[PDB]
């Protein structure tokens, strides 16, 4: 009967000179801490029990107390940063790393879970877990010919912890550790379990969220085609991180963006740009905005795949944040695109939704839309057709909005709008 003990009784049991009494009290503590209704984590910490749990981690001759104390410590380390810090300050990191090699799979799984929580807290604890030498034994746990012979939950916990070692910025994980972990992530990215795939995609999205050198580390391993395939998954928990990784990658150079395009990503965007999940739509439109900031042949790839009508659609009706990403996409398209491509954009109906967005209460989207209008007018000048575009803008109500913006609080707004009026509506 280790259910519902008081903290005083747990302390009495853990301070007894009786390994079995200590074990029973430790299990009682684990059960307290694993209740979803406000676990008394802080009371356990104040009782001074973390050092006792950490010392129990080292009793190889009593694996049950190793297991129970590991689980109690894991439940503490899954809370606030101060509670994770309490666990770390007790010396738990090297003890859990030593337990990674346990012959009891449940104990090593508990150690994997604990190190995942600790490393997930933040950059400093992540780098400290790495310094204590966790990566080698972690990856050795996965050194089997077929991942499918491992228990499902075990492999899932390993993948989650590895993703947490790839997580957080300022600073990003050490390049050495990233290189050490990447091959295993590449293997996990091909494993048939939705949760393993989701967490591998999350790890990749963490590693690609940075300068082009990190992106390049990831892209050199050849994972972009697999990322696109997973972009096409039906499980939203897979699509979300896969799309995040692809967007990150296209924030890089034009060659990395081209690697995304060559893998077939664009063919998936009709659905992504109409996805019923608002965040999928927003991230797909952000990815598109970065693609249309590339070379003219990449804008042309966007055109060939019939995605300009979907950007018109998103601009016309979507969550306002998605519409802002779409305005960005249009401004980049018009800034980098050929005359023919801007003409095509107009022929797809961009002008009316573009104008309708000028009544928004957001200054940045107004600046972006005015930049797009100026670029389109530049193309029209190059074609000597500013009157046609002026009439088009005037017929859908854009001229009223621009003349109203001429008197806007922001300096840039009234400047750009006055320029447009004087230049093409006089």
Numbering used by the authors: 72 to 497
Provide passages from the article that reported this PDB entry.
Active transport of proteins from the cytoplasm to the nucleus is mediated by a family of nuclear transport receptors known as importins (or karyopherins), together with a number of ancillary proteins including nucleoporins and Ran1–3. Importin α is constructed from an N-terminal importin β-binding (IBB) domain and a C-terminal NLS binding domain featuring ten armadillo (ARM)-repeat motifs. The W proteins of henipaviruses share a common N-terminal domain with P and V proteins, but have a unique NLS bearing C-terminal domain that is recognised preferentially by importins α3 and α4 (KPNA4 and KPNA3), rather than the better characterised importin α1 (KPNA2). In this study, we present high-resolution structures of importin α isoform adaptors bound to the NLS regions of HeV W and NiV W, providing insights into the molecular basis of importin α isoform specificity.
To extend on the structural repertoire of importin α structures, we tested whether these ARM repeats are similar in the structures of importin α isoforms that do not contain bound cargo. Importin α1 and α3, crystallised in P212121 and P1211 space groups, respectively, both contained one chain in the ASU. This is the first report of these adaptors being crystallised without cargo bound in the NLS-binding pockets, although a dimer of importin α1 has been reported previously. Comparison of the cargo-free and W NLS-bound forms of importin α1 showed that the structures were remarkably similar with an r.m.s.d of 0.180 Å across 408 residues, and importantly, the positioning of ARM repeats 7 and 8 remain unchanged. However, the position of ARM repeats 7 and 8 was retained in both the cargo free and bound forms of importin α3. These results suggest that ARMs 7 and 8 do not undergo conformational changes to accommodate binding of the W NLS in either importin α1 or α3. We superimposed importin α1 structures bound to a variety of NLSs including monopartite and bipartite, NLSs within domains including CAP80, and BiMax, and found that in all structures the importin α1 C-terminal ARM repeats 7 and 8 were in the same position. Similarly, superposition of a variety of importin α3 structures confirmed these regions are highly similar in all structures and allow for favourable binding. This supports the notion that the positioning of these ARM regions, highly similar across a wide range of structures, is conducive to high affinity binding of W in importin α3, but not importin α1.
